[PDB]
A paper describes a structure:
We investigated the roles of three conserved prolines at positions 107, 226, and 258 in the β‐lactamase BlaC from Mycobacterium tuberculosis and found that mutations can lead to dimerization of the enzyme and an overall less stable protein that is prone to aggregate over time. BlaC has 15 proline residues but only these three are 97%–99% conserved among class A β‐lactamases (Armon et al., 2001; Ashkenazy et al., 2010; Berezin et al., 2004). It was found that substitutions in all three prolines lead to an overall less stable enzyme, more prone to oligomerization and aggregation. We propose that one of the roles of conserved prolines in BlaC is to prevent protein association and maintain the monomeric state.
Pro226 is found in a loop between β‐strand 3 and an α‐helix in an α/β‐domain, interacting with Trp229, another highly conserved residue. The crystal structure of BlaC P226G solved to 1.3 Å displays virtually no differences to the structure of wild‐type BlaC, with average Cα RMSD of 0.34 Å. Surprisingly, even the loop containing residue 226 displayed no changes. The absence of the pyrrolidine ring allowed for an additional ordered water to be present in a mutant structure. For BlaC Pro226 variants, the structures closely resemble that of wild‐type BlaC. Changes in NMR resonances of amides were localized around the mutation site and virtually no changes were found in the crystal structure. It is plausible that this highly conserved proline located in the loop limits protein dynamics. For Pro226 variants, T m values were about 2 degrees lower than for wild type, and for Pro258 variants, T m changes were small, indicating that both these residues are unlikely to be essential for the thermal stability.
Author numbering: 27 to 57, 59 to 83, 86 to 145, 145A, 145B, 145C, 145D, 146 to 238, ...
The structure:
């Protein structure tokens, strides 16, 4: 069989560009499809953003209260827009950024990293520290979802983001306590049920972070565990840029790509 052919078939069926990377393991070959092509992050960056904040702070920092105003709600923020009067702690922001893809939470965590560009330069530097020489964050939410096709701003590659996530969740980029917090937030994500999760049977554990954007962008980055406890990182990125900036993102493409991956990994 030819898995690349099957991924190409999905692209034709959905009128999409699909990128996949599943890193090789001691027991499995890599799966790679358009893995070194650029795709917009969209909200997938929020997982390594949380890691960046965890990395540079003691865990007591999760209790730091962050205050903000209604004027800070500039992007879709399901949690933050209900806590303008209370504020939210850094831990609550991490939780919201991952589990509800909260954009204000993400922007506040970017600001917590500090430096020029509201934290976007700092975040890119955190990726550089993980060996990622390609990815770049140039804008805050929501502008980071809106760059035109071909613009390298706010892009990663499936290969790069998969190896970032590998290091964060399965590797030693974070100490194991911080690692566990990231993993738990991703494990309780609320936004991913129709993406990679939908391609793996219920006996597989899936943790993930979605992203969605203009030009039909729909991404999901996950770590999955087999029914025997073997983990794999699965990065699936897509866009439908040929359809214009208002092309519909297609969750089902990601679910089907995931089902193809699940077929190989079973």
């Amino acid at each position: 069989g030819d898995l690349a052919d099957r991924f190409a078939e999905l692209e034709r069926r959905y009128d999409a560009r699909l990128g996949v990377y599943v890193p090789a393991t001691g027991t499995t070959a890599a799966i790679e499809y358009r893995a070194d092509e650029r795709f917009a992050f969209c909200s997938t960056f929020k997982a390594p953003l949380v890691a960046a904040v965890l990395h540079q702070n003691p865990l007591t920092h999760l209790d730091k209260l962050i205050t903000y105003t209604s004027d800070d709600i500039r992007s879709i923020s399901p949690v933050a827009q209900q806590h303008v009067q209370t504020g939210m702690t850094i831990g609550q922001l991490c939780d919201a950024a991952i589990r509800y893809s909260d954009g204000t939470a993400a922007n506040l965590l970017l600001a917590d990293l500090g430096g020029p560009g509201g934290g976007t330069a700092a975040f890119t530097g955190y990726l550089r520290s993980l060996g990622d020489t390609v990815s770049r964050l140039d804008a805050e939410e929501p502008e980071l979802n809106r760059d035109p096709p071909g613009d390298e701003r706010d892009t990663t590659t499936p290969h790069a983001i998969a190896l970032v996530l590998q290091q964060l969740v399965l590797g030693n980029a974070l100490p194991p306590d911080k690692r566990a917090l990231l993993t738990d937030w991703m494990a309780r994500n609320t936004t991913g049920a129709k993406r990679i999760r939908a391609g793996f049977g219920a006996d597989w554990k899936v943790i993930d972070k979605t992203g969605t954007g203009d030009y039909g962008r729909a991404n999901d980055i996950a770590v999955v565990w087999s029914p025997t406890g073997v983990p794999y990182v699965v990065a699936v990125m897509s866009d439908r840029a040929g359809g214009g900036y208002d092309a519909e993102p297609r969750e089902a493409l990601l679910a089907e790509a995931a089902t193809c991956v699940a077929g190989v990994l079973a």
